[PDB]
Write a protein that binds this ligand. Sequence first.
Ligand SMILES: C[C@H](O)CP(=O)(O)O
Ligand SMILES: C[C@H](O)CP(=O)(O)O
Ligand SMILES: [Fe+3]
Ligand SMILES: [Fe+3]
Ligand SMILES: [Fe+3]
Ligand SMILES: [Fe+3]
Lengths: 179, 190, 186, 186
Amino acid sequence: MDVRTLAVGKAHLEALLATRKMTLEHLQDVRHDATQVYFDGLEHLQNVAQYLAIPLSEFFVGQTQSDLDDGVKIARRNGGFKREEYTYEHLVTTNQDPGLMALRLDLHSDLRLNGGHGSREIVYVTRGAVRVRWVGDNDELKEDVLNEGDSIFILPNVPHSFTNHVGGAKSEIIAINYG
Amino acid sequence: MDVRTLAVGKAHLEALLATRKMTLEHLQDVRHDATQVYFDGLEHLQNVAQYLAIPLSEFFVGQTQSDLDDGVKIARRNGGFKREEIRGGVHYYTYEHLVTTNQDPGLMALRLDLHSDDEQPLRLNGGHGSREIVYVTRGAVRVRWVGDNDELKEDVLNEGDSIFILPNVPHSFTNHVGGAKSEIIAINYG
Amino acid sequence: TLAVGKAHLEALLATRKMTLEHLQDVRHDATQVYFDGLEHLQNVAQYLAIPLSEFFVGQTQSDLDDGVKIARRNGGFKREEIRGGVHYYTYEHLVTTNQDPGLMALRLDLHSDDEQPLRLNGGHGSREIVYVTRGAVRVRWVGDNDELKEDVLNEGDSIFILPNVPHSFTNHVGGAKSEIIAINYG
Amino acid sequence: TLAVGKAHLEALLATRKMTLEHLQDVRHDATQVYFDGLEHLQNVAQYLAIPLSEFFVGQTQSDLDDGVKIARRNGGFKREEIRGGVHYYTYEHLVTTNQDPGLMALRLDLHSDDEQPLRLNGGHGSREIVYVTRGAVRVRWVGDNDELKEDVLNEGDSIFILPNVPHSFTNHVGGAKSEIIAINYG
Ligand SMILES: C[C@H](O)CP(=O)(O)O
Ligand SMILES: C[C@H](O)CP(=O)(O)O
Ligand SMILES: [Fe+3]
Ligand SMILES: [Fe+3]
Ligand SMILES: [Fe+3]
Ligand SMILES: [Fe+3]
């Protein structure tokens, strides 16, 4: 089977139209049914976005089906994505907050700073002793040590690095990027 | 041409991927260019959205190109959308769009002629999410709205007067005089 | 003596997983919690690690009457504006409300024109939309690469202005004095 | 005497197209504008039609040092939680900062289990993610159509919780006491 068409939730499209004081009838020739409005591919949708002066993104907001189960989502140790770089392991991830990236890390250690990022970040040390380095004010390098149970908050776009303090003793941290 | 095909900005996709600590290579089955990544149709994209655990919408957030020219956009009288509004078989308003822009879709600026008055039945709306400010450019305007404890309230606005309306407060503007047709400007936003 | 809405303070406390009892040195009543002035409140803001501002968000009493507020022509603030000794505008407030301090709605008479020197502003954080109610308006603004641009707006025409774009409205004709509405917001 | 940052006040004034001069009876210096206590400030808030909160937004001083803040085990607030008359949790604050009051990071010991009665909370505005650092955790929550649901989380498992979803974490094994990390935010 094959579909030539793009589907958009009708209720949603109508609601967008009403923000511009319009109704379906003010669109072109579009077929609709009881739940869906159909387009001849992306380019057709873009034109309609231009006409309504609304970013394309808006036409899908809400239209992906929640990955939750009864208001909640659960992940398991090793159940998701996992990779060597650090050893990164995804914790629970959800389409109900794409801005949220929760990680577990093993540190393999010893300088390789990142470039900072748009997310705020909080890190908690679950095991061992962690060397943290970051670029402070006036681009001066700073450092400190975090022990099991200690935590740190990091402002957006502050460059940073976590390594083992001891060397050989391999530590574990949790990192939550969000907002 | 290929109407099925879906394009997604590469830089954006890459950035999304790096939020999940991935790269394009982890999507084995996609063509890309220098600027674009392409998908075989919607179903392909949905699968990828699942895999990355991100709503389909995310792939386009930010990607729309500004309709401004040098930080500004200009509209002309009658240059845009325009329409009559009839509520219960009562001709109520003529809506005219003022400037509209994709840089603030939440902004709806209107010019209105009023056609109804006290001889017609009342046709409130159901309020709306937007805040609203209205200015009277011409004539004398009857404004009615549902206040506290669902009690109906009313007042009259004259040329140069103005009113702010909290979200979801139901309201109606009509001519005070009846026959004398008034004009207002309405700005919905936020 | 400082009063803070109890429901609000409690709600803030619960964000830090606390309750009133964890502030040992405060009297409360059914609706209000009381402090020994600002300095006492600042210490508590420190303790909760919350900006002082938060303790008042929502607490100013609405200036609306039944979900609405009304202003009258000439009823509010009004003022002349003179830039470099050039009479440029007459600003008149339209309705203003503490339920959206970010909203500044104005009516303006234009006094300047092309015979006067140009007096741009520095742009501003607010988005702005302008509608011409009367006459013909010369609009100038700094575009991309800091290049000056210009156009003319007639009765009924409108314009949207991105934040921090510097701009100026003047009469196109000179002597013929125009009127516009300007809405700054968000 | 109340102090308000001059630059901030000026900026607020310019949103209403005003300047300091338009304030009846205020002293200023180079950095500060001064009021005769809160009531004076409230009147000015009325005059400008701006909530009182606005006069402090931004004005709390950052608790960060070089873009970062660090907390230590037991270094901050800590407390027992008793619901009905069942010892349920030991809350410990992790790093907290006035640069994101919406962020509440916690470490918890669990004391209750299936022999105790169930003590759900009422959900909350924050999103929440929880990670199990130690033991085995019984998690119960109110799902769709108000139906109670349950599952078990083991060391290293995690869970996301939508706003205002009511929930409870207890020990799966009575007596074996588990530990979790909870991050409320946004
Ligand atoms: C002037 C009114 O607010 C227009 P409506 O919101 O009823 O579409
Ligand atoms: C309508 C104009 O934008 C007024 P200004 O911003 O120059 O105060
Ligand atoms: Fe990181
Ligand atoms: Fe309206
Ligand atoms: Fe302006
Ligand atoms: Fe909770």
